[PDB]
Amino acid sequence: GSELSERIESFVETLKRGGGPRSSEEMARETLGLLRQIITDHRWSNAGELMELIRREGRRMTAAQPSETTVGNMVRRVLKIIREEYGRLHGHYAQLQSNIIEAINELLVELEGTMENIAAQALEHIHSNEVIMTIGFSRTVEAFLKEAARKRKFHVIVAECAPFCQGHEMAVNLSKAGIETTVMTDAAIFAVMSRVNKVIIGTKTILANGALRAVTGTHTLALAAKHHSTPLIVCAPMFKLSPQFPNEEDSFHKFVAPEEVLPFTEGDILEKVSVHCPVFDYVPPELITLFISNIGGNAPSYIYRLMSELYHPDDHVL
Amino acid sequence: KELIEYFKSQMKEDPDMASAVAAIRTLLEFLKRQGLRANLTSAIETLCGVDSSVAVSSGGELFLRFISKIMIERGELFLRRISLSRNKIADLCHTFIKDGATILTHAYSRVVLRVLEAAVAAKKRFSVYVTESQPDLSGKKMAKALCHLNVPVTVVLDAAVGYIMEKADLVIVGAEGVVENGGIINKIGTNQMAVCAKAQNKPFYVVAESFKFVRLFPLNQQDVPDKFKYHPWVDYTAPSLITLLFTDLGVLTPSAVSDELIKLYL
Amino acid sequence: PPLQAVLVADSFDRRFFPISKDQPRVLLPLANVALIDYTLEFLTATGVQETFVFCCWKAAQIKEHLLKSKWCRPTSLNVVRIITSELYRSLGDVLRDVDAKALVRSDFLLVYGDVISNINITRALEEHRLRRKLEKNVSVMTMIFKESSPSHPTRCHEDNVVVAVDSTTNRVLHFQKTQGLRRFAFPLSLFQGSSDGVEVRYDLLDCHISICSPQVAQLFTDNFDYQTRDDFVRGLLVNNQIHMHVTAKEYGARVSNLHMYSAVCADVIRRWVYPLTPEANFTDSTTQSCTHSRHNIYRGPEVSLGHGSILEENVLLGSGTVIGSNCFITNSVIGPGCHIGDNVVLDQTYLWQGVRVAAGAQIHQSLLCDNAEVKERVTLKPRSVLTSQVVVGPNITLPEGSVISLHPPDAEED
Amino acid sequence: DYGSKVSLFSHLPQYSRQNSLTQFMSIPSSVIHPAMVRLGLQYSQGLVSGSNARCIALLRALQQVIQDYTTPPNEELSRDLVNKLKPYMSFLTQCRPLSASMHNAIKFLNKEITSVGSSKREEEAKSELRAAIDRYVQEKIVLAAQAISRFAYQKISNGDVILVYGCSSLVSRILQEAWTEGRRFRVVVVDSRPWLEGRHTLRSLVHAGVPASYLLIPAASYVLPEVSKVLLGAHALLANGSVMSRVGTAQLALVARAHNVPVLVCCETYKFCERVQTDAFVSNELDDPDDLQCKRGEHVALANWQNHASLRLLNLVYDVTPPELVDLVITELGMIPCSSVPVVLR
């Protein structure tokens, strides 16, 4: 009934003003659960009508927050699942709803196991007496790093984020396990990155041409890595892959209040000074070297095939 | 003005005389005709207006610097010394060409012509590729003057410099003016050839005299004064794409010109 | 206990006068969007579950605007209730009426219908309740202040205040304004009884947001000549305790006069009130969508930008607004359905809906309300306000601070 | 030393701000001169952090010391003064590592003192030393910025978008002088933690009337596309052409090169050192590590970072930029390339 409507409204309102679930995995789980909920109890008698309803709901969710490119991926995945389950019978409509829930539950189990599947490939890329540089705070990268510390000894360098210094929390959580971590500012990313050998970072989403949307300052890190010819591993699950391409990207960066960059207590200079605080940035694919996912490491030049296997080319614009 | 008259006289009497050399000759001839410094600056602007090239401006600046009884003597000595700059550059550059190498040359230039005429005189054999230089068909004149010396020249297309770059062992081009940072002001189709040569690790050599050193420091294609470009006629090449420099002062690196200019103080 | 607030959607003070004659203060379009919308969004985002909207001056327009708005929909979690009355003359009367009706139960917030803020009050509200539960019936009010600089444009002298509170436990011991006064006086009782940790604070911006208690309304009914909040605090401090809560990472300000109006507008367009921005479209409206681009330039649908015009800084164009050729607009807010001429310079100008500006006009730091019109060769100076439906003839140069209105006595008539 | 240093930065001193060196000293300082004592205290407490301000304060303190210096009998002053000034420099270095400007200045002062012969009187020697210090300051600091202000005025154009970083007494002056000559441009001020000294330049520009912008260095790749020039200031110019400046300069120049933006550098001739450096590891400076502590949200995450024996806090200050990222250098002699530092040193 209208309980579904109020749940959808609460979800959209939570996505509107601030962040809801802290972890991207929880965001994807909640989105898939909401999709399954709107699918299970609804008046629907065809496949195209359900596809249109799902497209409308996904459009609403995306308009709520354009930078949160995780709900659109789940919407497109559900659309692809529906299309495949409809074509398997048409190429009908007797028990499609019964197996749609089964496919959604399988996708949920995959989303639950993706973290363990990604963390299992830690030793294959880290050796003894190695130094690794990261940036920001990512749970996947944290697991990837602490899965190798139990059998290897390396030096982890962590570059904080100037607007929201979240790298301190990552460094503390890592040092809590005895990994010999380090803390530093963003300005010291190039002068210090001459003794580093490997770089392992996360991202918010992966674009179509191999590029990705990462936190601010990741572009300078990738530039330094390419200047020093150091590998740049990206630990990102499958749900972080977006079929959209690098359009001129006006709504790409998330602009927040300048309170973080410049405080309100500065004085009268705030009226004639324009302060900008972009949270995310665009990272080209040429500066990337590898992509570690729950299905094995791949190169940036092969993400198009993963997309073709995940989403349908007709649902790219939604 | 009779200044332009004398300039055209020197240019027409001697066809192979450089523009800067003719300008300095006219300036020294008119010097025989304080107050003098403004008089000279005035002569240099009219001359500069008639021929808009960096070489004339560099020569005028160098002459005025030389001007700061004795001046006639120093000027005659300077003219006689700069007369043999072509031979001084040839005797030093013609040795860098080895048998079996393919040359890639830009539009016509008397200095590279002299260098090649001296190289072929030493019992050597090589191949040349001249660019047509679409702005004005002078590359065809260069190819003609080269084939006149019994050398297998071959005129290439202005857009084919990248197609034949792999079939070239080295690149030897002229220069209208050497900027302070070692860069060079050459024909509009020079910055694109140096980029390809650098992209394929091809030795990019530059041949220029000493009177072509100018106190300019352009950061890009825009910092170049418009009076030199005027479809622009010249472009600036960064020093990172130049391998060496052959001047009458000896074989120099892209950085030695800055030291020379600092020693001269403009 | 669900959090409930009371909204006074009428400021009996008349500072926008002449403008408040045709159209209420709380529905003046700030950024193509009314102020009461900002206040309702703040209340709905901070956790308020129920609001009581009180209106006396032009209440019909307020209610008939609210009933189309998204907060009155059956899908809104903050159910709003409009109580209109012609007897109200000051905030004290409103609180007296609440006490007479027994509407409020628990800690309620007292905010005006012209407050723009993104502050979260969960922390301050917890502090208030815990403090009241350690001293039963001792703490009665908690005033929220935003620490700022005394140099900031938002700090007008008309609202400027100075406080002397205890640092051990945030508690207001003295509160007074500084309008037209150069050396402040602080009595000796502060040091007479207690407050070893006492300090004077002058770096505070009065957000006019207060977490009140039913005892506040009780005391307001007791004292009949409490006409506002400031006098409640002064009369309680001569004698219950009043405390504070200071914020440093959130924005909050009240639009009290015209100078204050142009100060929040620049901040809102400059994303200082994030998430509340024009790009977010927090009203669920169809005629206020925009796209945020570089330099905080907001463009709506059907902007009809002419070739040659340059948008240099934080501007906001409306839906349906038409821009000509070779124009220059900067720091300017344009409303929906505006239509500009050619060679038109706009510098810190606020144009509302239905405005037409002819070619050759130069407007600087002045505000054009609905249905305004200016002919060719007209130049307006700073603070040169035009009210509704005026027309300025060609070749006129208005002095600074000039006010033109169609009402005879309001200002210099058309 | 205070706290645990990094494994790769264990050959450099890491002092602290709370631990003062004046605790184990007499209130009337006997072994050390009071002027030098207060100068070192200011350097340690951060009262004077400017590259040129530090040198000016050092030279004024040295003038004060010389004014009240008495030459003992049984020896000349030309050598006694040099032998006495060494412990003062050692104490100053113990308070805070010296900069290239201070090094060159003390070298020039020692050379001038050695140039004084015992044939001359004491008062004449002191007066000549004071006048020499005064005119050297006026030439290499005051008059060395007026020529750079009129040389960079040519490379500034109307509509330019100049990008600056940190705080520099020369960049701000160049911009304020170019704005008053007739140029109409806008500046982009980049800042980094924890010093946040770029706000100084921001305020100095706002008070001058130049349209300015402010953003943190991690967002430098987002605003550079619209930037036309990058004007940067440095502390020293090495002999290998490299540039020694604030830590957030090398990566800034790298991103500028990646975005195809010409980078510039402005430095005085007196900052032309003779040493060389290849990276920021062989010679750097580690300030107090507690500066990284930040009040983010409700609590601080590095409040008790020392309890974790494996956690380190790096607080590098200086960095070295390769000559491959610097296009032009501005000096009082004129516009010279990045690979012409030895020529000026000659």
Side-chain angles (χ1 to χ4, degrees), chain D residues 12 50 69-71 137 141 167 189 204 222 325:
Chain D
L12 299 170
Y69 152 79
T70 67
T71 171
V137 171
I141 302 175
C167 176
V189 180
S204 184
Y222 160 81
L325 308 174

Side-chain angles (χ1 to χ4, degrees), chain A residues 160 183 186-187 195 216 266, chain D residues 193 203 218 251 279 312 314:
Chain A
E160 73 196 36
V183 171
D186 302 70
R195 275 75 208 166
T216 187
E266 265 293 82
Chain D
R193 290 187 65 264
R203 206 168 291 101
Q251 82 185 34
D279 49 62
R312 257 62 169 178
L314 183 62

